[PDB]
Amino acid sequence: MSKARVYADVNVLRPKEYWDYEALTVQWGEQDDYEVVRKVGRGKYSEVFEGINVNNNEKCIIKILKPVKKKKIKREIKILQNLCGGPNIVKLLDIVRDQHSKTPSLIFEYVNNTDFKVLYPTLTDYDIRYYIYELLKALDYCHSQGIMHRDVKPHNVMIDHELRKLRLIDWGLAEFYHPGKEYNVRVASRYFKGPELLVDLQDYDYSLDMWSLGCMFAGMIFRKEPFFYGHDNHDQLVKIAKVLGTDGLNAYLNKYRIELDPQLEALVGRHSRKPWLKFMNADNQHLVSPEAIDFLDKLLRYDHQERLTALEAMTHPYFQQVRAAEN
Numbered sequence: 001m002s003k004a005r006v007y008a009d010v011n012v013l014r015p016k017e018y019w020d021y022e023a024l025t026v027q028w029g030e031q032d033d034y035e036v037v038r039k040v041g042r043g044k045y046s047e048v049f050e051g052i053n054v055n056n057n058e059k060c061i062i063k064i065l066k067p068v069k070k071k072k073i074k075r076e077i078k079i080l081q082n083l084c085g086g087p088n089i090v091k092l093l094d095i096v097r098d099q100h101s102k103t104p105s106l107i108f109e110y111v112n113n114t115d116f117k118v119l120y121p122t123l124t125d126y127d128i129r130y131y132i133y134e135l136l137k138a139l140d141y142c143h144s145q146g147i148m149h150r151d152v153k154p155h156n157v158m159i160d161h162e163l164r165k166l167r168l169i170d171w172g173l174a175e176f177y178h179p180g181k182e183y184n185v186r187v188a189s190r191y192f193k194g195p196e197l198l199v200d201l202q203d204y205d206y207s208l209d210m211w212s213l214g215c216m217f218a219g220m221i222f223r224k225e226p227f228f229y230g231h232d233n234h235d236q237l238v239k240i241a242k243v244l245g246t247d248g249l250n251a252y253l254n255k256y257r258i259e260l261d262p263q264l265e266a267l268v269g270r271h272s273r274k275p276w277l278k279f280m281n282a283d284n285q286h287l288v289s290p291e292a293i294d295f296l297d298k299l300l301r302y303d304h305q306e307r308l309t310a311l312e313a314m315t316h317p318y319f320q321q322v323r324a325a326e327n
């Protein structure tokens with residue numbers, strides 16, 4: 001039996017109007033208020049375009065959704081509404097649908113994002129600390145509002161580098177946290193899935209996002225994208241085990257009484273823990289200080305209960321300069 005160490009009762013104390021997302025009645029806007037300017041992306045969930053509001057001439061992002069169940073879309077909409085105005089939380093501007101096809105589109109604020117594959121390599125030590133701190137504000141906020149993002153990855157972190165503006169987007173996989181609830185482990189992107197998802201521990205919590213953040217962070221400071229490069233869910237756990245070591249995995253499994261599938265146990269084998277500095281090289285030297293390693297080490301723990309919470313992470317000395325500058 002596992003439960004979050006912080007914000008566990010947020011949804012217990014709030015009324016049904018907050019977490020009963022299926023009760024939501026979607027208020028449709030007008031499709032004609034928005035026009036496509038250029039396609040900027042695509043995914044299994046939607047096609048994304050840079051758009052413009054013909055009324056105010058303001059830029060926006062239009063995501064034309066592929067077939068989705070009523071329950072799922074209501075969940076994304078309710079969460080976006082509940083988190084409105086929070087630090088670095090993307091703003092949902094409107095929700096529209098095509099009459100004949102009933103194809104819905106979500107309208108979001110526009111962020112002039114630069115491909116992370118091109119942006120990250122140019123980030124300085126300070127830039128990394130700054131952007132990760134900004135992302136942490138968003139995570140502590142949603143966690144404080146009883147919501148788990150469950151899909152933290154570079155693709156869901158829009159950054160306008162010129163303006164130094166960051167937004168955590170795509171809340172379609174997010175969920176409300178309820179103590180003891182068993183969630184679907186089929187969330188997050190493989191390279192960012194926490195050990196809990198990989199060993200089928202269903203009663204996970206906000207801490208899942210912290211493992212994903214840790215993966216992003218490790219990728220940035222070590223200049224290795226992605227950090228844990230597995231080809232399937234089983235191999236993903238193997239990649240993690242070859243770094244953190246099987247001793248910690250065994251302890252983790254014993255604590256929560258989890259039994260790995262025979263095939264998985266075989267693939268994992270036995271591995272010694274590898275010091276974080278073994279990933280240091282001439283290319284990532286100006287970015288792997290002791291503070292960075294200490295911070296990373298406290299994020300990437302098998303036991304989700306051991307990981308730093310977003311609030312704790314924000315106070316780690318690694319971010320002391322960012323905090324000082326802000327104050």
Ligand SMILES: N#Cc1cnn2c(Nc3ccccc3)nc(NCC3CCCCC3)nc12
Nearest residue numbers: 040041048061108109110111112113155169
């Ligand atoms: N909500 C929201 C949201 C807000 N901006 N935004 C952007 N901005 C953007 C602007 C110009 C060029 C590229 C992107 N792209 C995507 N999704 C598309 C990206 C997904 C990650 C890989 C690159 C394309 N989603 C969003």
